[PDB]
Paper text:
Chalcone synthase, a well-studied ubiquitous plant-specific type III polyketide synthases (PKSs), is the first key enzyme in the flavonoid biosynthetic pathway. The biosynthesis of flavonoids starts with the condensation of one molecule of p-coumaryl CoA with three molecules of malonyl-CoA through the catalysis of chalcone synthase (CHS) to generate naringenin chalcone. Functional characterization of two chalcone synthases (CpCHS1 and CpCHS2) indicated that CpCHS1 can catalyze the formation of pinocembrin, naringenin, and eriodictyol, respectively; however, CpCHS2 was inactive. The crystallization investigation of CpCHS1 indicated that it has a highly similar conformation and shares a similar general catalytic mechanism to other plants CHSs.
Author numbering:
A (entry chain C): 5 to 403
B (entry chain A): 6 to 401
The structure:
């Protein structure tokens, strides 16, 4: 028998509208690093100035990175007091953990305070917390730590996403979607907070993929408030989450691997990451657009007629996706702007881009929060090789 | 505040409650008798000179409520790794080498059993939730499990790392929203825990680390969760109706865990059984109001629901029983798993769920929950976090 007790009404009432972004806040550590002269600083502080050839290669990596500056919790004083972090391969995890278990929820709190202020509702209305970081682990997690720092209700429903990597900006959108939609009244605080203190290390002539990481990764935290059924005249919608998908791309074993070791977090590239992403992105998107839009003539937007939020893992990914899909160069502009101003902040990146997109749209008096377009994409890429796809709708603006 | 015109939900949602459709479990092959574990433990850590500490540990084991545990570790592995037999040696790297391979492996064993019971093609799994407190890696154990099972590369994964002992409740809360908000979703949930990250030699000045050595065992459990079971094809066992999370008052620092170069370290700083047992009544009173209302004759007593309680240790079960005035039968299923397996962290509560339905079938009871319609699943861990889940059984 597949017998069951008599049905009862859904005991936890669900919402009816789509999960909606209601506020966005961001924060970065206070130490600014100009990319043009980062090689000078980096080879000085790692006591590596005798590696003249390797410094030239690193100057090339920095010059070609698409990054103008980065923010970091680390500075010269902290690094000098921790020589094991300045070496390429010395036991360090303990001091790295000591830093990030405190500083990632601290930075997350700064971003969350800004999101909550914009939202304009009292903190006690937050029912769910999603915390995402690739920088350290602890028990209780950063989610608990953030709850304490902000003074949220002790009954918030928390989800702690540790050690996930660069695609997880897409993942948290996918997680928040179901939380918000399946729970009437739920208001989800999503915080992504990333610090390079776990990955910073000195240079090695035989590990150029680890060196690329030293040129690309920067610090940042972003926070959003997600809910369904926004309260009219009280809350303000900015983006709607309509579709989510995840894909391990074909032939991509080992493309991006990271290991938490006694020497800290190591970062490995072993496949042509921009090549794998660009080779497969068309089928990923074609499937997503079919699910969202169907396929009747004149009903499916062209890729040039949606807004783009693409994780800028490096400039080559954006370049090769733009080439493969024949995007006009303005499509990737917002994603490139955040790469320029902040570098690769791992999971936090895509929310910085989302914030930049709406703020530029308002300033330039465009017809929507997504550059004048109704529909858009948010894409995360990372270990797997995992591609996270999110189809969004903007909101109309007065032009 | 304007929006575009509303449209129908683009990913259709389900209508019924999230339902447990299958359960499978698995344990490493090395069995450890709890009565003689102090002999084994003090020998393999070369600590036989700590005569008074061993007496203390024999007492802890005698009173643990545990008869046996399963572990990936054994004498051979431990002799090859003296840095794990010391109290405080750099070891993380070898611990990680073990658990990044072995926790998805053990999870795959439990998952294959769940999937076989479920009876549906594995390509029908749409989501994976992987939960562990044993190691971290990128890609994570969710990706590894997906590869080992041959699941569809488009499965939507949720990787829950470094969670701790409450997370068996957390994954029920996560699976609920995944299943209910997505028509057709079938969620593979796996909890897999290995003591290789926490095992270490004894210290006469850190008795709380000695607690973990007496209580923690290894295991993995897997469930298939979905809403709207396919008629005459899938078989419901339990329904998820209500979930809540609470950080209990005055519990700051009661249970901390840190991942260090010496592995995962375990710290107890307040009266954990006391904090849980003194605050659980308020938590459950709230959940029962939300689920059943406040009307005379409408709300079941705690004695008239089935219990699935994370057996962090015997004192938690004993004090919850006393503070809530439970008859002794209520904690029996939870105590049975503690006896047969020890504290398997997040995986425990799903072992208890499996035992409960299996004992119900073999004893020809009226429901999959010991004959009771409504039940509770509780997880407890760092925070101090209490995860509460109200379940419904099915008639038998």
């Amino acid at each position: 028998n597949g017998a069951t007790f008599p049905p009862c009404a859904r005991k936890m009432e669900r919402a009816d509208g789509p999960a909606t972004v209601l506020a966005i806040g961001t924060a970065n550590p206070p130490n600014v690093f100009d990319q043009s002269t980062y090689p000078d600083f980096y080879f000085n502080i790692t006591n590596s100035n005798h590696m003249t050839d390797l410094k030239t290669k690193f100057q090339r990596m920095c010059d070609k990175s698409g990054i103008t500056k980065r923010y970091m919790y680390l500075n010269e004083e902290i690094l000098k007091a921790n020589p094991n972090m300045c070496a390429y391969w010395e036991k360090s995890l303990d001091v790295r953990q000591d830093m990030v278990v405190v500083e990632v929820p601290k930075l997350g709190k700064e971003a969350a305070t800004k999101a909550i202020k914009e939202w304009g509702q009292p903190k006690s209305k937050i029912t769910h917390v999603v915390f995402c970081t690739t920088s350290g682990v602890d028990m209780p997690g950063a989610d608990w730590a953030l709850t304490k720092l902000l003074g949220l209700r002790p009954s918030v429903k928390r989800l702690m996403m540790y050690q996930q990597g660069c695609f997880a900006g897409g993942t948290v959108m996918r997680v928040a979607k179901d939380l918000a939609e399946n729970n009437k009244g739920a208001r989800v605080l999503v915080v992504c907070s990333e610090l390079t203190a776990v990955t910073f290390r000195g240079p090695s002539e035989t590990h150029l993929d680890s060196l690329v990481g030293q040129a690309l990764f920067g610090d940042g935290a972003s926070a959003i408030i997600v809910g369904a059924d926004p309260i009219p005249e009280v809350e303000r919608p900015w983006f709607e989450i309509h579709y989510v998908a995840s894909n391990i791309l074909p032939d991509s074993d080992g493309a991006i691997d990271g290991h938490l070791r006694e020497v800290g977090l190591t970062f490995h590239l072993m496949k042509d990451v921009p090549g794998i992403i660009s080779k497969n992105i068309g089928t990923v998107l074609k499937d997503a657009f079919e699910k969202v839009f169907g396929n009747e003539e004149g009903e499916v937007p062209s890729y040039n007629d949606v807004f783009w939020i693409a994780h800028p893992g490096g400039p080559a990914i954006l370049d090769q996706v733009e080439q493969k899909l024949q995007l006009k160069t303005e499509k990737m502009a917002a994603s490139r702007q955040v790469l320029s101003d902040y570098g690769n902040m791992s999971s936090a990146c895509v929310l910085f881009i989302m914030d930049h997109l709406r703020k530029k749209s308002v300033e330039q008096k465009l017809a929507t929060s997504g550059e004048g377009y109704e529909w858009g994409l948010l894409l995360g890429f990372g270990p797997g090789l995992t591609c996270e796809t999110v189809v969004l709708r903007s909101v109309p603006l007065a032009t």
